[PDB]
Amino acid sequence: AFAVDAAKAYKDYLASGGQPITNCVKMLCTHTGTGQAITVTPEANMDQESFGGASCCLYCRCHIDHPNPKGFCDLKGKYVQIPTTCANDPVGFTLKNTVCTVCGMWKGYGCSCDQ
Amino acid sequence: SSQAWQPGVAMPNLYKMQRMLLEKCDLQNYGDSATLPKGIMMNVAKYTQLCQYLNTLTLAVPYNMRVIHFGAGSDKGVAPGTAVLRQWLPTGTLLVDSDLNDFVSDADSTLIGDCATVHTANKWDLIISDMYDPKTKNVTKENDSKEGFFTYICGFIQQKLALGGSVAIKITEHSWNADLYKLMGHFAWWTAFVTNVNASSSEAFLIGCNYLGKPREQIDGYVMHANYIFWRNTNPIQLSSYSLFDMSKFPLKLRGTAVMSLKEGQINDMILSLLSKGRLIIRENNRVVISSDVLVNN
Numbered sequence: 569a570f571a572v573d574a575a576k577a578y579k580d581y582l583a584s585g586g587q588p589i590t591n592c593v594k595m596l597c598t599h600t601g602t603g604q605a606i607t608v609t610p611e612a613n614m615d616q617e618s619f620g621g622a623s624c625c626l627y628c629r630c631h632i633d634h635p636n637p638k639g640f641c642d643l644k645g646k647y648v649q650i651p652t653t654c655a656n657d658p659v660g661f662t663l664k665n666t667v668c669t670v671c672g673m674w675k676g677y678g679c680s681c682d683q
Numbered sequence: 684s685s686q687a688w689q690p691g692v693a694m695p696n697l698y699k700m701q702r703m704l705l706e707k708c709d710l711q712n713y714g715d716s717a718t719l720p721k722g723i724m725m726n727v728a729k730y731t732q733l734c735q736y737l738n739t740l741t742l743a744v745p746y747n748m749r750v751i752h753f754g755a756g757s758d759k760g761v762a763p764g765t766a767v768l769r770q771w772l773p774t775g776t777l778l779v780d781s782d783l784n785d786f787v788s789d790a791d792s793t794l795i796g797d798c799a800t801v802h803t804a805n806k807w808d809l810i811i812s813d814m815y816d817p818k819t820k821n822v823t824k825e826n827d828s829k830e831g832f833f834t835y836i837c838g839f840i841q842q843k844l845a846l847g848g849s850v851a852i853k854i855t856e857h858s859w860n861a862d863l864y865k866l867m868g869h870f871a872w873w874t875a876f877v878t879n880v881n882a883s884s885s886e887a888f889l890i891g892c893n894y895l896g897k898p899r900e901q902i903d904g905y906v907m908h909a910n911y912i913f914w915r916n917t918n919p920i921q922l923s924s925y926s927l928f929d930m931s932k933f934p935l936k937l938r939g940t941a942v943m944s945l946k947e948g949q950i951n952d953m954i955l956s957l958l959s960k961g962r963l964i965i966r967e968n969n970r971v972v973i974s975s976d977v978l979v980n981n
């Protein structure tokens with residue numbers, strides 16, 4: 569029942585003081601967007617940067633199978649918004665954080681559905 | 684210069700009417716760098732200015748618009764230009780990209796391999812090409828018309844570009860083709876566009892706007908490339924990134940341009956008039972099928 573867990577391998581490489589994956593495609597935008605995590609068009613707000621989805625996907629970048637039964641990708645063809653404070657490692661940010669299913673913002677980075 | 688606030692500079696009409704001899708390109712800006720917004724790649728800035736400029740033309744923009752992008756990969760293994768085209772094109776637009784080398788894209792579909800192995804049953808509304816071979820830059824030989832992928836691009840425009848469609852093909856002092864200049868005469872309007880962020884490069888985008896399928900003016904490719912070099916040698920362009928700080932009017936407006944599947948014996952003068960204004964696209968509206976040839980040899 570073997571299978572390569574790349575998400576864990578990258579986190580272990582980051583904790584080991586490794587260099588984050590670079591060349592993530594940062595987009596030009598007004599920075600007056602919704603602030604939602606993954607969008608069809610850049611929706612960065614003043615506290616965020618928008619990136620090309622494919623360039624921020626660990627699976628797409630390492631050319632390995634996606635952890636989705638049909639081998640489908642969430643980021644490819646979309647735009648992922650990353651807090652300006654974490655834009656130094658967008659791939660690592662998408663692996664560690666979760667998208668709120670009711671408002672669409674990142675958990676603990678905009679999602680306020682818990683108040 | 685009020686051109687600093689433009690996304691780039693188009694070749695003035697008076698330079699297109701000359702008969703100059705091909706000379707070496709010698710830019711005064713050469714070696715300079717534009718101040719890019721923090722963390723933005725050159726190709727994101729470059730494609731953004733190209734798109735800002737295309738927003739000013741009579742592009743046909745139908746529903747389910749079909750766009751193909753050649754030379755979309757990079758040494759980094761990502762497709763910065765494709766990400767900008769995805770941001771620029773209206774939702775529901777089909778975006779297919781291709782490159783000789785493996786790369787990761789935001790396109791609906793990506794084909795890997797020589798552009799000569801790419802086949803497609805259907806026609807396209809817009810063709811973008813950033814295909815370039817650094818070998819072509821040779822100052823120890825004559826600067827002659829180049830073939831390679833240009834031969835494929837010329838056949839692709841003539842047989843797969845929808846009437847009313849437009850193209851943006853990247854050229855340089857040495858990466859150019861005489862037949863591609865000749866073909867710009869088959870469009871309602873054409874120009875050579877230089878982005879302000881790369882104004883220090885002999886690079887330019889030949890823009891054919893609204894394909895008529897027949898020659899409107901007779902263009903000598905050798906003479907026109909000589910005219911392009913003369914324009915670049917005599918008109919220094921101030922490097923500028925000003926147009927990049929205002930993205931409020933960036934997205935291409937969906938005009939819902941009409942798509943008709945007309946036969947060739949029906950193209951009258953009143954139809955060519957609608958193609959010229961960017962108010963009509965002529966191609967089948969069938970499903971999109973693409974394929975990559977695989978040469979098998981053990």
Ligand SMILES: C[S@@+](CC[C@H](N)C(=O)[O-])C[C@H]1O[C@@H](n2cnc3c(N)ncnc32)[C@H](O)[C@@H]1O
Binds near residue numbers: 756
């Ligand atoms: C300037 S790079 C393209 C950069 C890309 N537009 C970007 O956004 O970064 C030129 C590309 O043309 C590709 N190319 C050159 N000759 C080709 C050919 N005959 N068929 C397909 N791709 C080709 C190269 O592999 C290279 O990736």
Ligand SMILES: [Cl-]
Binds near residue numbers: 819857885
């Ligand atoms: Cl060159």
Ligand SMILES: [Zn+2]
Binds near residue numbers: 627642644
């Ligand atoms: Zn992916």
Ligand SMILES: [Zn+2]
Binds near residue numbers: 670672681682
């Ligand atoms: Zn929420």
